[PDB]
Write a protein that holds these residues in place. Structure first.
Motif, PDB file in Angstrom:
ATOM      1  N   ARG A 104       0.829  -1.200   0.000  1.00 39.36           N
ATOM      2  CA  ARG A 104       0.000   0.000   0.000  1.00 39.36           C
ATOM      3  C   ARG A 104       0.871   1.261   0.000  1.00 39.36           C
ATOM      4  O   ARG A 104       1.768   1.396   0.846  1.00 39.36           O
ATOM      5  CB  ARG A 104      -0.941   0.015   1.218  1.00 39.36           C
ATOM      6  CG  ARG A 104      -1.372  -1.352   1.748  1.00 39.36           C
ATOM      7  CD  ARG A 104      -2.548  -1.910   0.962  1.00 39.36           C
ATOM      8  NE  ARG A 104      -2.819  -3.317   1.262  1.00 39.36           N
ATOM      9  CZ  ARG A 104      -3.504  -3.733   2.322  1.00 39.36           C
ATOM     10  NH1 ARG A 104      -3.967  -2.842   3.188  1.00 39.36           N
ATOM     11  NH2 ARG A 104      -3.720  -5.033   2.523  1.00 39.36           N
ATOM     12  N   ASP A 105       0.655   2.152  -0.973  1.00 42.64           N
ATOM     13  CA  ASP A 105       1.115   3.534  -0.831  1.00 42.64           C
ATOM     14  C   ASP A 105      -0.097   4.455  -0.810  1.00 42.64           C
ATOM     15  O   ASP A 105      -0.593   4.867  -1.868  1.00 42.64           O
ATOM     16  CB  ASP A 105       2.036   3.939  -1.986  1.00 42.64           C
ATOM     17  CG  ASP A 105       3.134   2.938  -2.240  1.00 42.64           C
ATOM     18  OD1 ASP A 105       4.315   3.324  -2.135  1.00 42.64           O
ATOM     19  OD2 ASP A 105       2.817   1.770  -2.548  1.00 42.64           O
ATOM     20  N   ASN A 106      -0.539   4.828   0.384  1.00 45.95           N
ATOM     21  CA  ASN A 106      -1.661   5.747   0.511  1.00 45.95           C
ATOM     22  C   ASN A 106      -1.182   7.141   0.871  1.00 45.95           C
ATOM     23  O   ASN A 106      -1.960   8.089   0.980  1.00 45.95           O
ATOM     24  CB  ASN A 106      -2.669   5.204   1.510  1.00 45.95           C
ATOM     25  CG  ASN A 106      -3.288   3.902   1.036  1.00 45.95           C
ATOM     26  OD1 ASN A 106      -2.817   2.812   1.375  1.00 45.95           O
ATOM     27  ND2 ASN A 106      -4.338   4.010   0.229  1.00 45.95           N
ATOM     28  N   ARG A 143      -7.433   6.253   4.611  1.00 48.24           N
ATOM     29  CA  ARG A 143      -6.660   5.137   4.079  1.00 48.24           C
ATOM     30  C   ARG A 143      -5.244   5.202   4.605  1.00 48.24           C
ATOM     31  O   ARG A 143      -4.667   4.191   4.984  1.00 48.24           O
ATOM     32  CB  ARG A 143      -6.649   5.148   2.552  1.00 48.24           C
ATOM     33  CG  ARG A 143      -7.935   4.670   1.907  1.00 48.24           C
ATOM     34  CD  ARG A 143      -7.937   4.956   0.410  1.00 48.24           C
ATOM     35  NE  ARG A 143      -9.291   5.201  -0.087  1.00 48.24           N
ATOM     36  CZ  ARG A 143      -9.615   6.155  -0.960  1.00 48.24           C
ATOM     37  NH1 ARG A 143      -8.676   6.960  -1.444  1.00 48.24           N
ATOM     38  NH2 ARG A 143     -10.877   6.306  -1.353  1.00 48.24           N
ATOM     39  N   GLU A 191      -3.631   2.299   6.698  1.00 47.15           N
ATOM     40  CA  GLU A 191      -2.444   1.620   6.204  1.00 47.15           C
ATOM     41  C   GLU A 191      -1.435   1.498   7.325  1.00 47.15           C
ATOM     42  O   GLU A 191      -0.910   0.424   7.594  1.00 47.15           O
ATOM     43  CB  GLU A 191      -1.812   2.349   5.027  1.00 47.15           C
ATOM     44  CG  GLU A 191      -0.668   1.547   4.425  1.00 47.15           C
ATOM     45  CD  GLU A 191       0.383   2.404   3.741  1.00 47.15           C
ATOM     46  OE1 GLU A 191       0.000   3.319   2.980  1.00 47.15           O
ATOM     47  OE2 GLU A 191       1.596   2.157   3.968  1.00 47.15           O
TER      48      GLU A 191
END
Lengths: 71, 271, 77, 76, 70
Positions: A1-3, C12, C16
């Motif tokens: 994940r790159d949020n 998000r 994360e």
């Protein structure tokens, strides 16, 4: 994940504008993105620490504010 | 020292690179130009007719600074012998292209433009480099710095990012550049290393004791250990101290009596 | 109260970072809003320090150099 | 360790005349205030130094201290 | 006197330990002023701990607390 990529350039410009920044170099968005991720990580890390000291699985606004006092 | 003559050939093989600025300049205006790799050397073709030559056998270190994390992409040449162009003599000649831009106070398609130029530029540079390395029979090689081993410091009274390469400690993105050949280093000595200090100076002493020590100032303590670890992988010895020491006086003392200096136990005075 | 960052992508980001932790974790909306209110406040204040720095260098445009200096004096990592 | 003790306490007492107003400081405490100051100025100078560097100057100027203190949140 | 707790060479030594290579002449008074402000805030915060308890004598301990408020 790159949020951290989801926090948006216009968002960063907006924040900057409020800090009174007139003009901005191109590398500001990645730096800012990283700077934020570090900060956010510290608070969340500190915050969950208050959450399991109380033996809970759910983070209250109370956890978050106490953590900010450490920062 | 006088150079040899550039040997230029007219033929199918002429690796070339466009859109390159030359540091330092030939005027108070930036001379853009093109760089060409000939048989024994490098030709730089400027727009204004100004032409500078660099010989592969004069190249001490050849550096490639990619554009990752930067606003430019660099070819850097550290020279064995200063060569003269403009007024002064210059041991350091480099060639760069700018990849980045300045906003005033969400454009999407224009971001494809961004990464593509960044991709073009660095593919342009790699493909040229791969040729030139092949033309010399891998005898001349571009050293790319290890960014994981980097640290910030103030050699020049700006705070830049210094990076090790195989043979050198380097900054090619700021002018004047910073190049230090590791083989020429006698030892490192760290100063102002003490608790409650957020910054230390690092002192580079050369095997050639006539050469003044090179300082790197105000490095964050957090980097003190990573650096030490790198120093060992280089067989560069190091030492520590709280106090800032007078090195021109120390080097004077040693160069004036190189014999009795080693009768005290030599560098042991650093402990 | 102003909230210059859009709430959804910020969320998000918080979830994360919620991995790499107790793998079962939930957040109260108020807790996520608190984090968000804190972050935007940190960025704005940081941008003020940053802009001071660029001024000190006789510049109108801020650069990572400015941020890094500012964060360094503040004692951040 | 880095400052002379005598003129420092002349400052401590000169400050002490503004508070209780009758005050006398335990010797250990005068010493603990000097220790605290030295550390404060050193770390301030470290930040000052970085500011000068940012400006491409070897020399530090009150410009520099003022910027460091501003970012540190000392005097606006 | 004209020195507020700090002599010019002590200022230079302090700045030296901070990484300072050179000193504008203007620094001594700037350092002196800035030191008076820090010292006051800490003294001020200290004696308040001293009169929270009842004492007319400030101890080292009253200083350690004044500092954990900054």
């Amino acid at each position: 994940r790159d949020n951290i990529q989801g926090i948006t350039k216009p968002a960063i410009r907006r924040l900057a504008r409020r800090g009174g920044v007139k003009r901005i170099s191109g590398l500001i968005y990645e730096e800012t993105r990283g700077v934020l991720k570090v900060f956010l990580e510290n608070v969340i890390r500190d915050a969950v620490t208050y959450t399991e000291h109380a033996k809970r699985k759910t983070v209250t606004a109370m956890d978050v504010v106490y953590a900010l006092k450490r920062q | 020292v006088k150079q040899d003559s550039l040997v230029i050939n007219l033929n199918r093989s002429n690796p070339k690179l466009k859109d390159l600025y030359i540091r330092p300049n030939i005027a108070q205006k930036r001379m853009q130009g093109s760089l060409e790799a000939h048989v024994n050397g490098f030709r730089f073709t400027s727009v204004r007719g100004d032409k500078v030559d660099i010989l592969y056998n004069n190249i001490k270190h050849a550096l490639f600074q990619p554009c990752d994390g930067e606003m430019i992409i660099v070819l850097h040449f550290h020279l064995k012998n200063a060569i003269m162009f403009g007024k002064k003599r210059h041991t350091d000649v480099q060639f760069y292209t700018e990849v980045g831009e300045i906003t005033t106070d969400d454009d999407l398609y224009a971001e494809q433009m961004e990464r593509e130029m960044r991709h073009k530029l660095k593919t342009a540079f790699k493909n040229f480099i791969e040729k030139v390395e092949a033309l010399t029979k891998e005898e001349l090689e571009f050293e790319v710095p290890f960014r994981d081993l980097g640290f910030n410091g103030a050699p020049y009274r700006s705070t830049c990012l210094l990076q090790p390469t195989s043979s050198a400690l380097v900054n090619a993105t700021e002018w004047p550049p910073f190049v230090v050949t590791l083989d020429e280093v006698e030892l490192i000595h760290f100063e102002r290393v003490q608790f409650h200090l957020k910054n230390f100076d690092m002192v580079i002493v050369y095997k050639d004791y006539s050469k003044k020590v090179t300082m790197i100032n105000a490095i964050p303590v957090a980097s003190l250990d990573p650096i030490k670890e790198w120093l060992n992988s280089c067989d560069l010895k190091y030492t520590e101290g709280v106090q800032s020491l007078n090195w021109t006086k120390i080097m004077k003392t040693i160069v004036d009596d190189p014999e009795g200096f080693f009768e005290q136990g030599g560098w042991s005075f650093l402990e | 109260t102003e909230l210059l960052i859009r709430k959804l992508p910020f969320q998000r980001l918080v979830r994360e970072i919620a991995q790499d932790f107790k793998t079962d974790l939930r957040f109260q909306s108020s807790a996520v809003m608190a984090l968000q209110e804190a972050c935007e406040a940190y960025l704005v204040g940081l941008f003020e320090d940053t802009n001071l720095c660029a001024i000190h260098a006789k510049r109108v445009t801020i650069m990572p150099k400015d941020i890094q200096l500012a964060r360094r004096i503040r004692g951040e990592r």
